Write an enzyme that holds these catalytic residues in place. Structure first.
Site, mmCIF file in Angstrom:
data_model
loop_
_atom_site.group_PDB
_atom_site.id
_atom_site.type_symbol
_atom_site.label_atom_id
_atom_site.label_comp_id
_atom_site.label_asym_id
_atom_site.label_seq_id
_atom_site.Cartn_x
_atom_site.Cartn_y
_atom_site.Cartn_z
ATOM 1 N N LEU B 124 0.551 -1.470 -0.092
ATOM 2 C CA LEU B 124 0.061 -0.068 -0.147
ATOM 3 C C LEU B 124 0.998 1.443 -0.309
ATOM 4 O O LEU B 124 1.682 1.373 0.790
ATOM 5 C CB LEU B 124 -0.625 0.137 1.322
ATOM 6 C CG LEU B 124 -1.710 -1.325 1.288
ATOM 7 C CD1 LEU B 124 -2.499 -1.043 2.597
ATOM 8 C CD2 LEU B 124 -2.918 -1.282 0.803
ATOM 9 N N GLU B 125 0.253 2.033 -0.945
ATOM 10 C CA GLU B 125 1.230 3.788 -0.925
ATOM 11 C C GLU B 125 0.676 4.467 0.167
ATOM 12 O O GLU B 125 -0.781 5.149 -0.265
ATOM 13 C CB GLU B 125 1.342 3.614 -1.988
ATOM 14 C CG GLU B 125 1.766 3.344 -3.213
ATOM 15 C CD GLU B 125 1.493 3.090 -4.533
ATOM 16 O OE1 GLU B 125 1.049 4.245 -4.849
ATOM 17 O OE2 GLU B 125 2.045 2.428 -5.254
HETATM 18 C C1 LIG Z 1 -2.945 -1.948 -7.221
HETATM 19 C C2 LIG Z 1 -1.474 -2.951 -6.201
HETATM 20 C C3 LIG Z 1 -0.490 -4.177 -7.090
HETATM 21 N N1 LIG Z 1 -0.180 -5.057 -6.371
HETATM 22 C C4 LIG Z 1 0.659 -6.078 -6.516
HETATM 23 C C5 LIG Z 1 -0.593 -6.881 -7.381
HETATM 24 C C6 LIG Z 1 0.116 -6.528 -9.112
HETATM 25 O O1 LIG Z 1 -1.066 -7.525 -9.930
HETATM 26 C C7 LIG Z 1 1.048 -5.820 -8.858
HETATM 27 C C8 LIG Z 1 1.902 -5.529 -10.328
HETATM 28 O O2 LIG Z 1 1.748 -4.252 -10.158
HETATM 29 P P1 LIG Z 1 1.426 -3.676 -11.730
HETATM 30 O O3 LIG Z 1 0.932 -2.285 -12.203
HETATM 31 O O4 LIG Z 1 1.526 -4.562 -13.432
HETATM 32 O O5 LIG Z 1 3.219 -3.382 -10.914
HETATM 33 P P2 LIG Z 1 4.064 -3.256 -12.537
HETATM 34 O O6 LIG Z 1 3.930 -3.081 -13.590
HETATM 35 O O7 LIG Z 1 5.157 -1.611 -11.831
HETATM 36 O O8 LIG Z 1 5.319 -4.574 -11.974
HETATM 37 P P3 LIG Z 1 5.097 -5.280 -13.328
HETATM 38 O O9 LIG Z 1 6.357 -5.034 -14.579
HETATM 39 O O10 LIG Z 1 5.542 -6.675 -12.478
HETATM 40 O O11 LIG Z 1 3.604 -5.333 -13.595
HETATM 41 O O12 LIG Z 1 1.643 -5.193 -8.097
HETATM 42 C C9 LIG Z 1 0.092 -3.763 -4.729
HETATM 43 O O13 LIG Z 1 0.859 -4.976 -4.109
HETATM 44 N N2 LIG Z 1 -1.014 -2.762 -4.472
HETATM 45 C C10 LIG Z 1 -1.377 -2.521 -5.207
HETATM 46 O O14 LIG Z 1 -2.015 -1.265 -5.029
#
Ligand SMILES: Cc1cn([C@H]2C[C@H](O)[C@@H](COP(=O)(O)OP(=O)(O)OP(=O)(O)O)O2)c(=O)[nH]c1=O
Ligand SMILES: Cc1cn([C@H]2C[C@H](O)[C@@H](COP(=O)(O)OP(=O)(O)OP(=O)(O)O)O2)c(=O)[nH]c1=O
Ligand SMILES: Cc1cn([C@H]2C[C@H](O)[C@@H](COP(=O)(O)OP(=O)(O)OP(=O)(O)O)O2)c(=O)[nH]c1=O
Ligand SMILES: [Mg+2]
Ligand SMILES: [Mg+2]
Ligand SMILES: [Mg+2]
EC number: 3.5.4.30
Lengths: 177, 177, 177
Positions: B124-125
């Site tokens: 979480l952010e």
């Molecule tokens: C929306 C969200 C996702 N996530 C996790 C679950 C998602 O399936 C995962 C990827 O989100 P993405 O937006 O796909 O992250 P990314 O594109 O920066 O990373 P990648 O290059 O691996 O795709 O992050 C969180 O920890 N917190 C959140 O609030």
């Protein structure tokens, strides 16, 4: 339903949907990554004392030739996607940041659903929520679209931002009502 | 689109979806509440002057034994859910804050759709948008997931954050492009 | 599926869904615009030193007769829609800002899905992310709802904010567990 990445690919190939220019690896399990363009807009803080919804607001715009741009702490900036998107009448798309980006305190505040029938680049609302500046590299994957189907007859998007190119300043003052 | 709370309960009991540990009262009309874990990450401001997308950023991480954590005004912090979530290939989930939390100026900036096939805790952010510090109580319901079905063949999540545990720092610098 | 604007109109006319008061032009391709009300709530900084989830927080509330309100830079404010919304059990709605508004650095942070069965005005979390104050005009279109169908049996909203009127302060301290 939300469209799988594969379904998005199919619809692109069949021209039901357009997203251009695009690399195949931008396609994700149920979304498609978009990239940060070179064009930026900021409110002209030297000229405006107050922001208004009732008249145009002065702003500075520029295209950078540099590889990166700096967004200082607690600062808000308008940007754009490299990609131009064209949605048919029966799809909508949710714009959101990539988790990797949000985790560094860069918030894509514009998160929302694109009107069916929208045609243009996507204007992004960037906010640096850290106490340190962030270096944004141009052309890197910054956000993503999640597609969803729309049921029923649709009157397609005919609003202010049809065919927008570049970070496009608000035209809220044109509201008819 | 959206799964009712009852449907979510069914899918949990049939192990189509996993969310654990979980109390039945976290199930809502069309969402499921998740809770704030004890683990936190912040950027190492004694070692970094600028945030970059092109290399790792140093950070401090910790697990608290206190009942609460204090987030000072205008400060950004990474946190995690207590819950580990495992999604099958045909579901995606929208993470968002609870209205009660956002109304106190604590923004869950990470709001977005979880990739089908994702397996891990949710990072979480957190951003305190007030001029006062906020006391966040550990283990309280802080956000929620809204589930939607995915149409079409799915290539499941194989990205950076598979199996993540704890507040997990960005690995944006691992992007292939 | 997401409801088209036309479908939203039909359901309004047949009273499957209520949004009132409403002009037909608030209906959009796949959303409906809502307007800013005259009522506002801010945390009482003169009485509170720290924000808590465990007890009520003092606040100031007021209704303005002026055409506009000023939101100072980097300030968070609670507001409300003019519209009262009543959702049946089989619909949910995503609240989000209008692009024109977000582009001026006014963030609608409360972006999320309304519980099926919800009945009330919508409380908005406004954040001015600029370095200048913003003049918000009362009665202008500030946000929008995107409607989605809910699949499965629904236990309707029975939470804290049923029948809410005005900008409604958080009641997070009423959580059980
Ligand atoms: C929306 C969200 C996702 N996530 C996790 C679950 C998602 O399936 C995962 C990827 O989100 P993405 O937006 O796909 O992250 P990314 O594109 O920066 O990373 P990648 O290059 O691996 O795709 O992050 C969180 O920890 N917190 C959140 O609030
Ligand atoms: C969500 C989003 C939308 N848009 C575009 C796509 C939408 O179809 C378009 C309008 O969004 P709206 O949210 O409808 O904006 P608006 O109501 O201010 O504009 P109008 O009066 O013309 O309806 O804005 C972006 O450029 N960036 C974004 O992040
Ligand atoms: C998204 C949103 C919801 N709401 C209302 C409609 C939702 O049905 C209601 C609850 O949203 P929730 O996100 O469930 O808030 P909560 O869990 O803090 O409260 P509860 O314990 O009552 O479930 O709040 C707003 O007033 N403004 C908003 O922007
Ligand atoms: Mg990704
Ligand atoms: Mg709730
Ligand atoms: Mg619009």
């Amino acid at each position: 339903m939300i469209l799988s990445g594969k379904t998005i690919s199919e619809k692109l190939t069949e021209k039901e949907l357009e997203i251009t220019p695009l690399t195949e690896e931008q396609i994700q399990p149920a979304s498609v990554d978009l990239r940060l363009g070179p064009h930026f807009v900021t409110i002209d803080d030297s000229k405006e004392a107050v922001i208004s919804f009732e008249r145009p607001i002065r702003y500075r715009e520029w295209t950078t030739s540099d590889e990166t741009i700096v967004l200082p702490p607690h600062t808000f900036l308008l940007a754009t996607t490299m990609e131009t998107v064209k949605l048919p009448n029966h799809l909508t798309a949710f714009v959101e940041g990539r988790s990797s980006v949000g985790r560094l305190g860069l918030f894509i505040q514009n998160a929302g659903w694109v009107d069916p029938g929208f045609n243009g680049q996507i204007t992004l609302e960037l906010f640096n929520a850290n106490r340190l500046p962030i270096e944004l590299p141009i052309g890197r994957r910054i956000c993503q679209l999640v597609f969803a189907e729309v049921t029923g007859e649709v009157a397609p998007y005919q609003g202010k931002y049809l065919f927008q190119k570049g970070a496009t300043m608000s035209e809220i003052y044109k509201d008819a009502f």
